[PDB]
Amino acid sequence: ASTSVKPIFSRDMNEAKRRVRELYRAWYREVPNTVHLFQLDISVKQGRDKVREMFKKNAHITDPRVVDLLVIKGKMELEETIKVWKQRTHVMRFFHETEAPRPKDFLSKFYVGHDP
Amino acid sequence: GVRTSPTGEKVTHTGQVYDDGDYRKVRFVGRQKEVNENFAIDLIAEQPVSQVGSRVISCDGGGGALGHPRVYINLDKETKTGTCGYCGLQFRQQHH
Amino acid sequence: EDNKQFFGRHRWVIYTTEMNGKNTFWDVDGSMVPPEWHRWLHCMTDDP
Amino acid sequence: TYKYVNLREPSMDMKSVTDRAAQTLLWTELIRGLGMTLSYLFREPATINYPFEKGPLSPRFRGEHALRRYPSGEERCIACKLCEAVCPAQAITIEAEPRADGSRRTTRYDIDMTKCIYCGFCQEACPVDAIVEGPNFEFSTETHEELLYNKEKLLNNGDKWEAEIAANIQADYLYR
Amino acid sequence: TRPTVRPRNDVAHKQLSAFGEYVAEILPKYVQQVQVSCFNELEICIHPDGVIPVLTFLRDHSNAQFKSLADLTAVDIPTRQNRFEIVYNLLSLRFNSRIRVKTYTDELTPIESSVPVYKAANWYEREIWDMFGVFFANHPDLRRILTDYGFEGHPFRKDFPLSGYVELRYDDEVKRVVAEPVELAQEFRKFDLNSPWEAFPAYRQPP
Amino acid sequence: GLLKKTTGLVGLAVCETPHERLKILYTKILDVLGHIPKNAAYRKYTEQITNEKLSMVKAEPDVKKLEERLQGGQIEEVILQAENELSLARKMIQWKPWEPLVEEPPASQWKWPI
Amino acid sequence: ASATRFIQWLRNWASGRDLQAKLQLRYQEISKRTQPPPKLPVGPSHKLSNNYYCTRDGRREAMPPSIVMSSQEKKAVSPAPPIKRWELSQDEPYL
Amino acid sequence: FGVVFRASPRQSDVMIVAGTLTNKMAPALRKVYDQMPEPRYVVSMGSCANGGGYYHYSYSVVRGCDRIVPVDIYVPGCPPTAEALLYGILQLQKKIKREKRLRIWYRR
Amino acid sequence: NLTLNFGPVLRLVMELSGEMVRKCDPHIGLLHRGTEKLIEYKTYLQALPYFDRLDYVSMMCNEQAYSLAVEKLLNIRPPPRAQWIRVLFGEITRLLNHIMAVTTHALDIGAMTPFFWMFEEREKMFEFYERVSGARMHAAYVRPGGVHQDLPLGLMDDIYEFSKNFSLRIDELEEMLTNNRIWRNRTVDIGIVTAEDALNYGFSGVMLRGSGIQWDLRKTQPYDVYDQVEFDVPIGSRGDCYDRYLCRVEEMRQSIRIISQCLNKMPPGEIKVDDAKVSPPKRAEMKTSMESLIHHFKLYTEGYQVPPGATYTAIEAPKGEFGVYLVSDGSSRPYRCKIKAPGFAHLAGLDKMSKGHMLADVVAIIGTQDIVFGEVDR
Amino acid sequence: TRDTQLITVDEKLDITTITGVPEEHIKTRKARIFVPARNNMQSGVNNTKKWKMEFDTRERWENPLMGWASTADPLSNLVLTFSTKEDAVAFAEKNGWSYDVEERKVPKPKSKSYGANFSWNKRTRVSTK
Amino acid sequence: SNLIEVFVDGQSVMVEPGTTVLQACEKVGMQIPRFCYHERLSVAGNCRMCLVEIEKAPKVVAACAMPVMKGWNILTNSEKTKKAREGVMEFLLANHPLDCPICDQGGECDLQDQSMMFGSDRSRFLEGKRAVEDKNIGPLVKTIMTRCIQCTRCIRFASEIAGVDDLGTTGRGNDMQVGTYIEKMFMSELSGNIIDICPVGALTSKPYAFTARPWETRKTESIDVMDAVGSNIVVSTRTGEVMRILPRMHEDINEEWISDKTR
Ligand code: SF4
Ligand code: SF4
Ligand code: SF4
Ligand code: SF4
Ligand code: SF4
Ligand code: FES
Ligand SMILES: [K+]
Ligand SMILES: [Zn+2]
Structure with missing residues (x-):
C-alpha cells in the first residue's frame, strides 16, 4: 500500500533504538580520546554533554527510517573523528565559541532587528 | 566642473559628497578621494548645434561601426533642438 | 630596438631616472610606460 | 588506424646482445643525456629582461576594465545594464537616473575586480563600446579595497588609457 | 542542404528503437518506459528494484556488452514525490553505442549499490550521497567525498541555498578557523530571465 | 595456424584450444537456458544468438577466419564473453525478469518538463 | 642565431642533430604585428529573398523523445552493428 | 631575481596563494602560514584568492584568502599573466625596501 | 601498519607495511567549488567560462564538450570553418596538456630539466590562445554555434612556424627519458592495469590504450571534422606507466600531424552559426538593423532558450573521455549540468594500481593518470 | 509484486532533522505557495503556468564600503517550481515550513465581438477606429 | 447545449458561439501572437500579427476578430501561419528605432519577445527610417512616439475604460500619428494605465525612467492602501529599494488596473 516502504536498516522503532544506543556508547567512549588527540581546551564532561545534547534535539523522531539516517550520519561523524580526518577546527564547530548568544526573548529581538 | 563642499571634499559628477558629520570620510584621511575631473554633462554642452536641411537627420555617433546604433531624429519642433538619445549631439532645422 | 634579436628581446625601454617627482634611478616599474608606448613595447603594433 | 608503441622484440644475435651489454656496462645511453644538456648550455636562453622587456601581446588582450567617451567628451555609457546582465561573475553593479539635462546615464558603475573573471563578455555585450578591457595588466594593489572600482576609477582609466584603447579597437573592430 | 540545422540520422534512430524494445521484452519485470530522443539517445526507465538485474544484463549480455560506466549522477526534481532521478550512462565498445538507464528514489528509500556490476560506481555513489543524500545499500565505504568534514546538508538539492548556511573565517x-552564519556584503542578485512567450510549441503541455 | 604470441590485451592470456573451449561454453549456456520458461524472451533471444556462434565454431577450423565470422575481436575476447553470458544466464534464473512489472511509477514520474 | 660557427658545431654534435635549422627562438620569420585590415565573409543566411526563418529554424525542429514503449520468430538485435576492427598503420606500424 | 622556484615551507619567506581556497582547505593553509618563520609575506594571486572570483557565491569557497591569512600584495586577473605575477613580486620587493624596522626600534 | 596522512591539493591517507603500500585512500574535495550548482544559476553563455576552469590544462577542449552538448540540444550545426578552428585548437590544446603531463610527471620523479625546455613551447602556444581570444588560458573562445571571433591575419603562418620545429623538441625530451635506464626503472612494470579492470573501473584515454584496448572517441564517435583528418592511435602492450608515457609522447606527434592538415584544409566562411537567435550578430549589423539589435539585446540578457531534453555528450579530451550530462527545462538556464571528469574515475582506481608497490611509486602512478583536481572536484 | 521486503510506517513524512537546515530557518520562516501573477507590461502568459514557493523577505542593508545591498538571509534567493498546488504543499510539509497557499487566478472568459463597435442603439459603439 | 465543435491543430474543443479564433486557441493552452488586441478593450484587428491559417481556407484570418465556425481546423503552427507572422513582424520593425538599450521597455517588451519567438532574425530593410515628433501629455506618462507601432490600445483605453476621448490618430498612411493634436495633458485618475497596455516603449512611466531593468527586480505581491478598493499590486524592488508599483490581475476588485495614486 501507500504506507509500505523499504527499510534502511531497521524494520521498527525497537530495532532502530538499538542502533541509537550502540552509537551513543561508541560516541561516549571516544570523547576522552578525542579531547586528548586534538588537544582540546574543553573538559571531558562538557564534551559528553554535547554528545548528549545532539542525541536529545532529535529525540522526538518516530519514523524508523529517519532514525536510521540519523544513525548513519552519526557513524560517519564518529568515523571522521576517530580516524583524525577532522582537525581541531572541525571538532570545535559543535560549540560555537565565536558567535555571541542570540537572545530568545521578544523584547531583546525587538530592539536589535526585524527578525522574529 | 568639480565643485567643493564647505568642508572641502570634492563633489563628484553624480552629485555625491559626504555630509559634515558622516564618519565614512575617515577613509580619505591619509589618502585621497578619486573624482574624475571631466564632467560629461559639461563637455557635451560645449559642442555646437548642427544645422541640417531636412526634417529627419540620422546620428550614429561618428565613426561608423565604432559609434552607437543609428537613430533618426525628428526636427519638426522649432522651439527646441533635436538631441541624439545615445551621444547628446544636438541638431536644428535650417529656417524651418 | 634591435631586430636581429629574437622575438621578445627585440624591443626594450630604459626607464627615466625621475618621473612625476619620484626618484626612479633604482626603483623602476613596468607601469611607468605611457599608453602610446605601451602598445609598441608589448608588440601590439609595429609602428611606434 | 593505430600503432604499437612498445611491441618490438630485441634481437638475440650475439652482436646485439653485446651491444646491449656495452650499453649497460659503459653507460652509453646515460651519456647521450649528458650530451643533450651540454647542448642547451651553449644555446642562448629564452629569458627576457623584464621589466625593461615585455612579453608580446595582441590587440584582443583582456586587461583592466575601463569606461570610454565619445570624441566630444560625453560618456558612451547609457546605463542599459546589458553588461551587468551578462557578467558571469556578477561583478558589475549599476544604478542610473535621468541626468540634469535629461540624458540617460549611470549614477553608479562599480566592478568588483576580485569577482571579475576577466572574460570580456561585457565589452562584447555593450552596444556603444563604453565598457572595455584595456591593455593594462600591471595594477596589483596592497589592499583588497583598491580592487573595488567605482565609476570614477573606471572613467579615470578611460581617460588614462584612451590613446591605447582606441588604437586596439581600431585594429580589431573588423573581426567583431 | 540546410547549413545551420543539425542533420538527422534516421538509421541510428531506428537501431536504438529496436534495441529498446529488445531490452523491454527481456526485462519486463523492471522496465517501465523506453524512449529515444530526437538526437538518438536511448533511455531505459526502470523500477529501482531492477538496478542490479538491468545493469548486469546490459553489461554481460552478448548483444549489449555495455562494459563501461561513463557516468552515474542524480537530478533533483522537487515536484515529484520521488524527487531524485538516478541516471546511469553506459558505453559499449563492442557495438560502439551508449545507453542511459534512469530510476528514482526519495530522501529515505535506499538504492542498491551497483558496485558489484561496475567498480567505477564506488565514488560516483559517494558523490550522489554527499551532494544529494541518497543512500546506497551495501556500499563498501559510504561517506562524504566532496564536502567539508562535518558539513550539514546536501548542497545539490534544489532547496539548498547557493551560498549555504555557514562561512569560514x-x-x-x-586561534583557529571558525564557522559562522553566512553574511554576504553583496547579496546574490536573482535575475528573472524567462520570457513570457512560449518558445517551443512542440513541447506544449496539455492545459 | 601458428598460435599467436599474445592477444594484445593485458591480462587476457592466449588460448591454445579456442574451438574446444567455445564448444563447451556455448553448449553449457544452452543447458542453463533449458531451466528458463519457453516463453521468456531471454530464452528465445539467447538461444538464437548462441546457436549462431556455435554454428560458426563447428563450421570453420581456421582461427583467423573464425574471428572475422564472429566479429568479436580476438578469439580470447569471444571466449571471455561466452563466460560472461554463462554467468548472466545463471543469475537471470534467480531474478526472473520475464515476470510482469513489479510496480507502476507515480502518475507523473517520467514527465519532463515538470 | 648569433652563436659562432664553433659553438654551433659543439651544440650540434653534443645533441646529435642540426639545431640551427629548427631554433626554439623566434627571429624574423613570424608574422608582422601590424596586419592589413580584414574583410570577413557573411554566412549562408545573408540573403534578401528566399530566406524565411521558418525554413532554417533548427530549434523548432527538435521534438520530444519518441516513446517506443510505456507502461501507461523475431530476430535478436544489438544497439548497432559490431565495431569494425582497426587496421594497422601504413605510416609507422611499430614505433 | 633571486626568487627560487620552490622552497620548503620552513625555509620560505613568502607564500603565494594561487587558486581557489575552499572551506575544506582553509585550516590547512592557516597551519602552513603559522609555521612560516618570520619575516613572512603573503601574495594573493588571482580573483579566487582575492575575493572568491567566479565562485564567490558558492557554499564551499572562502571569499578571499584574506579572511584566513593577512595579505601583502593582491594580483588581479583570472589568471594573472606570468608577467602580471612577476610585476607583483617586484612590487613586494619594493615594499620590503620601504620597511623601517630599525628606525621604529631606534625611535621607540 | 604505519598510517601516514600526506596532507596538502591532494590528501593521501596511506597504510604502509614497511616500504610497501597496503592501502591508498585519496581524500579529495580540497578544490570543490560547487561548479555544477553555480551553473544552474547562469544562462548557457554565462556557464561557458566555468568549463575553462575544470581541466585548466586543456581549456579549449572543455569548451568544445560543452558546446557540442548545447548544440545537440539546440539542434544546430556550427559552420565548417568553425569546426576546423575547433579541431585545430583542440590539438594545440592536446599538446599543451601532454607537455604538462609528461614533464610534470618527470619533474615529480626527479627529472627537472625537460620541464623548462617544453614550458617555453607552452609559452608560445599560450600566444596562439591570446591572439584569438585575448586570454592566455581561459579563452572562452569555443561557444555553442562556433567560435567567438575569426582567426586574425598572420596567425596560421605563426602556427606553421611553431609546428615545424616541435618534433625536434619532442625528440630532445625522448633523448632524456625514453632510453634512460633510470626513467625506465621508475615506470616499467609500475601500475599495471589489465584491460578488463580498466574497462570496469571506468578508465578512458591512455588508461585504456596503455592496456591494449583499441578505443578513441575521435575515431569511433567522431565530432566536428575529426573524420576528415588522418592520424594514428598509439596503443600500449604492458599496461604500465612506461607504455602510457609512450602513448602520450606519440599522441603529441600525431597532434602535430593533425595540425598540419588543419592548416592546409582550413576553409573559408563564417565562424559562428548564421542564426541570430543562437549566435549574436556582428557589431556592424547590431548598430544598423532593428532585428539585430533586438537579438543582440536578448542574447546577452536572457540568452537563447534550449528545448527541453537531456544529453550526454563526450569527447576525447587529452585526459580522457570528458563529457557532460546536460538537462534543459526549456528556459535559458540549465536545469542540471553533471560533469564527467575522466580523472575522477582514474583517481578512484589509484588504490588498485598501488597494490604491491612502494611509497615512491605512488608519485609515478598519480603522474601517469594525469590528474588535475579542477575536474576531479568541480 | 515486489520481492523486496517492505515495512509499515504510519507517520507524516518529516525530514527536518536530516536536511542540515539550521533550526532558525525551519521554524521562523513563512513559505508562500502561489502562481506568479502575469507581468502587466507584457501580454505573454507563459510565466503563469507553474506554482512557485518562495520565502518571506528579510532585511537588506547598505554595505558601508560600497553601498551594496547586504543580506544575512540564506533563503532570500530560493524559489522552487512545482507542477501543482498539492505537490508544492507536500514539499513544504515534509521540510517543516509554515506556508500560505494562494488560489490560482485565471482570467475570466470574455465575450468579444468586433461587430459591437458599430452598434445601432447600444452604447458599445466606438467613436474612433 | 449550444457549444459548437472547432479544432485547434486537430484537437477538439467545444466553444460557445461568438467565440473568436484567438479565444478558441486559448482553451488548448496556445496563445496567438497579438499587439493590438487586449481582452478588456474593444477589438481592432489592425496589427495583423494574429493571422492564422484555417485549414482549406486560402486566406489567413485575424484570429482576434474572426468568430470561429463549426468544424474549422485552426492551424496555429503551419508554414502559412508562420510566414504570415514574419512578414508582419518585418513591417513592424522596418521603421522602429534602434532604441532598445536606451528604452525603458527593454527586457519586458512584447515587440522584442515576439520578434525573438515568431519573427525573423535579420533585416532586409535598406532604407531610411521614420522619425516622429514627441508629445507632452503630462508629468506621469513620458512619450517617445517614434517607438509607437500604431496599435491604438491607448486610444481605446482612454475612450472606453477611462471615458476621456482625448487620444486619437491624426494624419494618414505611414505618417499617421497617435496623440492629442493640440497641446493637452492626459490627466485622468486612470491615466497611468496606458503605460502598461502600450506594448512598446512609446509610453513609459516618467518617474520610473531609467532607474531599473525588468530582469533585476524582485516582485512582491501585496495590496494597495491608498483607498478602500483593495487593489492588488506587485511591488518591484531592487537591492532593498522600492522601484515601481504595478497592477496585479484580480477579476473582482481592479481587473488589471490601478489609479495614479496607487501607481
Ligand atoms: S570581463 Fe567578464 S567578469 Fe570582468 S566585468 Fe566583464 S563580464 Fe564581468
Ligand atoms: S557599459 Fe555598455 S553595456 Fe554596460 S550599461 Fe553602459 S552602455 Fe550598457
Ligand atoms: S585562473 Fe581564475 S578561476 Fe582559476 S584559480 Fe586563478 S582566479 Fe580562480
Ligand atoms: S519598444 Fe521594445 S523593440 Fe522598441 S526600442 Fe523599446 S525595447 Fe526595443
Ligand atoms: S502609443 Fe502604445 S498603446 Fe498607443 S498606439 Fe502606440 S504602441 Fe499602441
Ligand atoms: S491582435 Fe489581431 S490584428 Fe492585432
Ligand atoms: K509601455
Ligand atoms: Zn548620436
Whole structure:
C-alpha cells in the first residue's frame, strides 16, 4: 500500500533504538580520546554533554527510517573523528565559541532587528 | 566642473559628497578621494548645434561601426533642438 | 630596438631616472610606460 | 588506424646482445643525456629582461576594465545594464537616473575586480563600446579595497588609457 | 542542404528503437518506459528494484556488452514525490553505442549499490550521497567525498541555498578557523530571465 | 595456424584450444537456458544468438577466419564473453525478469518538463 | 642565431642533430604585428529573398523523445552493428 | 631575481596563494602560514584568492584568502599573466625596501 | 601498519607495511567549488567560462564538450570553418596538456630539466590562445554555434612556424627519458592495469590504450571534422606507466600531424552559426538593423532558450573521455549540468594500481593518470 | 509484486532533522505557495503556468564600503517550481515550513465581438477606429 | 447545449458561439501572437500579427476578430501561419528605432519577445527610417512616439475604460500619428494605465525612467492602501529599494488596473 516502504536498516522503532544506543556508547567512549588527540581546551564532561545534547534535539523522531539516517550520519561523524580526518577546527564547530548568544526573548529581538 | 563642499571634499559628477558629520570620510584621511575631473554633462554642452536641411537627420555617433546604433531624429519642433538619445549631439532645422 | 634579436628581446625601454617627482634611478616599474608606448613595447603594433 | 608503441622484440644475435651489454656496462645511453644538456648550455636562453622587456601581446588582450567617451567628451555609457546582465561573475553593479539635462546615464558603475573573471563578455555585450578591457595588466594593489572600482576609477582609466584603447579597437573592430 | 540545422540520422534512430524494445521484452519485470530522443539517445526507465538485474544484463549480455560506466549522477526534481532521478550512462565498445538507464528514489528509500556490476560506481555513489543524500545499500565505504568534514546538508538539492548556511573565517581569539552564519556584503542578485512567450510549441503541455 | 604470441590485451592470456573451449561454453549456456520458461524472451533471444556462434565454431577450423565470422575481436575476447553470458544466464534464473512489472511509477514520474 | 660557427658545431654534435635549422627562438620569420585590415565573409543566411526563418529554424525542429514503449520468430538485435576492427598503420606500424 | 622556484615551507619567506581556497582547505593553509618563520609575506594571486572570483557565491569557497591569512600584495586577473605575477613580486620587493624596522626600534 | 596522512591539493591517507603500500585512500574535495550548482544559476553563455576552469590544462577542449552538448540540444550545426578552428585548437590544446603531463610527471620523479625546455613551447602556444581570444588560458573562445571571433591575419603562418620545429623538441625530451635506464626503472612494470579492470573501473584515454584496448572517441564517435583528418592511435602492450608515457609522447606527434592538415584544409566562411537567435550578430549589423539589435539585446540578457531534453555528450579530451550530462527545462538556464571528469574515475582506481608497490611509486602512478583536481572536484 | 521486503510506517513524512537546515530557518520562516501573477507590461502568459514557493523577505542593508545591498538571509534567493498546488504543499510539509497557499487566478472568459463597435442603439459603439 | 465543435491543430474543443479564433486557441493552452488586441478593450484587428491559417481556407484570418465556425481546423503552427507572422513582424520593425538599450521597455517588451519567438532574425530593410515628433501629455506618462507601432490600445483605453476621448490618430498612411493634436495633458485618475497596455516603449512611466531593468527586480505581491478598493499590486524592488508599483490581475476588485495614486 501507500504506507509500505523499504527499510534502511531497521524494520521498527525497537530495532532502530538499538542502533541509537550502540552509537551513543561508541560516541561516549571516544570523547576522552578525542579531547586528548586534538588537544582540546574543553573538559571531558562538557564534551559528553554535547554528545548528549545532539542525541536529545532529535529525540522526538518516530519514523524508523529517519532514525536510521540519523544513525548513519552519526557513524560517519564518529568515523571522521576517530580516524583524525577532522582537525581541531572541525571538532570545535559543535560549540560555537565565536558567535555571541542570540537572545530568545521578544523584547531583546525587538530592539536589535526585524527578525522574529 | 568639480565643485567643493564647505568642508572641502570634492563633489563628484553624480552629485555625491559626504555630509559634515558622516564618519565614512575617515577613509580619505591619509589618502585621497578619486573624482574624475571631466564632467560629461559639461563637455557635451560645449559642442555646437548642427544645422541640417531636412526634417529627419540620422546620428550614429561618428565613426561608423565604432559609434552607437543609428537613430533618426525628428526636427519638426522649432522651439527646441533635436538631441541624439545615445551621444547628446544636438541638431536644428535650417529656417524651418 | 634591435631586430636581429629574437622575438621578445627585440624591443626594450630604459626607464627615466625621475618621473612625476619620484626618484626612479633604482626603483623602476613596468607601469611607468605611457599608453602610446605601451602598445609598441608589448608588440601590439609595429609602428611606434 | 593505430600503432604499437612498445611491441618490438630485441634481437638475440650475439652482436646485439653485446651491444646491449656495452650499453649497460659503459653507460652509453646515460651519456647521450649528458650530451643533450651540454647542448642547451651553449644555446642562448629564452629569458627576457623584464621589466625593461615585455612579453608580446595582441590587440584582443583582456586587461583592466575601463569606461570610454565619445570624441566630444560625453560618456558612451547609457546605463542599459546589458553588461551587468551578462557578467558571469556578477561583478558589475549599476544604478542610473535621468541626468540634469535629461540624458540617460549611470549614477553608479562599480566592478568588483576580485569577482571579475576577466572574460570580456561585457565589452562584447555593450552596444556603444563604453565598457572595455584595456591593455593594462600591471595594477596589483596592497589592499583588497583598491580592487573595488567605482565609476570614477573606471572613467579615470578611460581617460588614462584612451590613446591605447582606441588604437586596439581600431585594429580589431573588423573581426567583431 | 540546410547549413545551420543539425542533420538527422534516421538509421541510428531506428537501431536504438529496436534495441529498446529488445531490452523491454527481456526485462519486463523492471522496465517501465523506453524512449529515444530526437538526437538518438536511448533511455531505459526502470523500477529501482531492477538496478542490479538491468545493469548486469546490459553489461554481460552478448548483444549489449555495455562494459563501461561513463557516468552515474542524480537530478533533483522537487515536484515529484520521488524527487531524485538516478541516471546511469553506459558505453559499449563492442557495438560502439551508449545507453542511459534512469530510476528514482526519495530522501529515505535506499538504492542498491551497483558496485558489484561496475567498480567505477564506488565514488560516483559517494558523490550522489554527499551532494544529494541518497543512500546506497551495501556500499563498501559510504561517506562524504566532496564536502567539508562535518558539513550539514546536501548542497545539490534544489532547496539548498547557493551560498549555504555557514562561512569560514580565522578568529584570532581562539586561534583557529571558525564557522559562522553566512553574511554576504553583496547579496546574490536573482535575475528573472524567462520570457513570457512560449518558445517551443512542440513541447506544449496539455492545459 | 601458428598460435599467436599474445592477444594484445593485458591480462587476457592466449588460448591454445579456442574451438574446444567455445564448444563447451556455448553448449553449457544452452543447458542453463533449458531451466528458463519457453516463453521468456531471454530464452528465445539467447538461444538464437548462441546457436549462431556455435554454428560458426563447428563450421570453420581456421582461427583467423573464425574471428572475422564472429566479429568479436580476438578469439580470447569471444571466449571471455561466452563466460560472461554463462554467468548472466545463471543469475537471470534467480531474478526472473520475464515476470510482469513489479510496480507502476507515480502518475507523473517520467514527465519532463515538470 | 648569433652563436659562432664553433659553438654551433659543439651544440650540434653534443645533441646529435642540426639545431640551427629548427631554433626554439623566434627571429624574423613570424608574422608582422601590424596586419592589413580584414574583410570577413557573411554566412549562408545573408540573403534578401528566399530566406524565411521558418525554413532554417533548427530549434523548432527538435521534438520530444519518441516513446517506443510505456507502461501507461523475431530476430535478436544489438544497439548497432559490431565495431569494425582497426587496421594497422601504413605510416609507422611499430614505433 | 633571486626568487627560487620552490622552497620548503620552513625555509620560505613568502607564500603565494594561487587558486581557489575552499572551506575544506582553509585550516590547512592557516597551519602552513603559522609555521612560516618570520619575516613572512603573503601574495594573493588571482580573483579566487582575492575575493572568491567566479565562485564567490558558492557554499564551499572562502571569499578571499584574506579572511584566513593577512595579505601583502593582491594580483588581479583570472589568471594573472606570468608577467602580471612577476610585476607583483617586484612590487613586494619594493615594499620590503620601504620597511623601517630599525628606525621604529631606534625611535621607540 | 604505519598510517601516514600526506596532507596538502591532494590528501593521501596511506597504510604502509614497511616500504610497501597496503592501502591508498585519496581524500579529495580540497578544490570543490560547487561548479555544477553555480551553473544552474547562469544562462548557457554565462556557464561557458566555468568549463575553462575544470581541466585548466586543456581549456579549449572543455569548451568544445560543452558546446557540442548545447548544440545537440539546440539542434544546430556550427559552420565548417568553425569546426576546423575547433579541431585545430583542440590539438594545440592536446599538446599543451601532454607537455604538462609528461614533464610534470618527470619533474615529480626527479627529472627537472625537460620541464623548462617544453614550458617555453607552452609559452608560445599560450600566444596562439591570446591572439584569438585575448586570454592566455581561459579563452572562452569555443561557444555553442562556433567560435567567438575569426582567426586574425598572420596567425596560421605563426602556427606553421611553431609546428615545424616541435618534433625536434619532442625528440630532445625522448633523448632524456625514453632510453634512460633510470626513467625506465621508475615506470616499467609500475601500475599495471589489465584491460578488463580498466574497462570496469571506468578508465578512458591512455588508461585504456596503455592496456591494449583499441578505443578513441575521435575515431569511433567522431565530432566536428575529426573524420576528415588522418592520424594514428598509439596503443600500449604492458599496461604500465612506461607504455602510457609512450602513448602520450606519440599522441603529441600525431597532434602535430593533425595540425598540419588543419592548416592546409582550413576553409573559408563564417565562424559562428548564421542564426541570430543562437549566435549574436556582428557589431556592424547590431548598430544598423532593428532585428539585430533586438537579438543582440536578448542574447546577452536572457540568452537563447534550449528545448527541453537531456544529453550526454563526450569527447576525447587529452585526459580522457570528458563529457557532460546536460538537462534543459526549456528556459535559458540549465536545469542540471553533471560533469564527467575522466580523472575522477582514474583517481578512484589509484588504490588498485598501488597494490604491491612502494611509497615512491605512488608519485609515478598519480603522474601517469594525469590528474588535475579542477575536474576531479568541480 | 515486489520481492523486496517492505515495512509499515504510519507517520507524516518529516525530514527536518536530516536536511542540515539550521533550526532558525525551519521554524521562523513563512513559505508562500502561489502562481506568479502575469507581468502587466507584457501580454505573454507563459510565466503563469507553474506554482512557485518562495520565502518571506528579510532585511537588506547598505554595505558601508560600497553601498551594496547586504543580506544575512540564506533563503532570500530560493524559489522552487512545482507542477501543482498539492505537490508544492507536500514539499513544504515534509521540510517543516509554515506556508500560505494562494488560489490560482485565471482570467475570466470574455465575450468579444468586433461587430459591437458599430452598434445601432447600444452604447458599445466606438467613436474612433 | 449550444457549444459548437472547432479544432485547434486537430484537437477538439467545444466553444460557445461568438467565440473568436484567438479565444478558441486559448482553451488548448496556445496563445496567438497579438499587439493590438487586449481582452478588456474593444477589438481592432489592425496589427495583423494574429493571422492564422484555417485549414482549406486560402486566406489567413485575424484570429482576434474572426468568430470561429463549426468544424474549422485552426492551424496555429503551419508554414502559412508562420510566414504570415514574419512578414508582419518585418513591417513592424522596418521603421522602429534602434532604441532598445536606451528604452525603458527593454527586457519586458512584447515587440522584442515576439520578434525573438515568431519573427525573423535579420533585416532586409535598406532604407531610411521614420522619425516622429514627441508629445507632452503630462508629468506621469513620458512619450517617445517614434517607438509607437500604431496599435491604438491607448486610444481605446482612454475612450472606453477611462471615458476621456482625448487620444486619437491624426494624419494618414505611414505618417499617421497617435496623440492629442493640440497641446493637452492626459490627466485622468486612470491615466497611468496606458503605460502598461502600450506594448512598446512609446509610453513609459516618467518617474520610473531609467532607474531599473525588468530582469533585476524582485516582485512582491501585496495590496494597495491608498483607498478602500483593495487593489492588488506587485511591488518591484531592487537591492532593498522600492522601484515601481504595478497592477496585479484580480477579476473582482481592479481587473488589471490601478489609479495614479496607487501607481
Ligand atoms: S570581463 Fe567578464 S567578469 Fe570582468 S566585468 Fe566583464 S563580464 Fe564581468
Ligand atoms: S557599459 Fe555598455 S553595456 Fe554596460 S550599461 Fe553602459 S552602455 Fe550598457
Ligand atoms: S585562473 Fe581564475 S578561476 Fe582559476 S584559480 Fe586563478 S582566479 Fe580562480
Ligand atoms: S519598444 Fe521594445 S523593440 Fe522598441 S526600442 Fe523599446 S525595447 Fe526595443
Ligand atoms: S502609443 Fe502604445 S498603446 Fe498607443 S498606439 Fe502606440 S504602441 Fe499602441
Ligand atoms: S491582435 Fe489581431 S490584428 Fe492585432
Ligand atoms: K509601455
Ligand atoms: Zn548620436
